[PDB]
Design a protein around this nucleic acid. Structure first.
Length: 63
DNA sequence: AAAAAAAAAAGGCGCCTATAAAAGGGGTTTCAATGTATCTATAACCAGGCATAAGTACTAAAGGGGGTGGGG
């Protein structure tokens, strides 16, 4: 009966957890948790999330 | 004392030895060199047992440099 625009993000559970951590810090990122591997995210924040994930993973001093 | 059987002995018969010289054939009996199965000393064969040399992996060591994380 209702539709809303957004960006669907499909990712592994560990990445889902990381995006939730990003949201908790920055807010206004995650619109809905959909399932263990899917989120609805603010479309204007998708590139931010992708860049931040890359930084979190690639720049980790314990790599 | 007698008849009887068993025994040793004799006499006789036959053939042997050494003598002799000289013409053709067939017999059995013993001994010659040349070979199978079995023997001998030799040479050569396997498997099994002990000692020495070569190769193994193993543990064994010490010496250092570089990168990442934590603390000041």
């Amino acid at each position: 009966a209702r539709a809303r625009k957004g960006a669907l993000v499909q990712c592994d559970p560990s990445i889902k957890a990381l995006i939730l951590q990003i949201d908790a810090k920055m807010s206004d990122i995650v619109l809905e948790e959909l399932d263990d591997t899917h989120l609805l995210v603010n479309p204007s924040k998708v590139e931010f999330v992708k860049h931040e994930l890359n930084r979190l993973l690639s720049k980790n001093i314990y790599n």
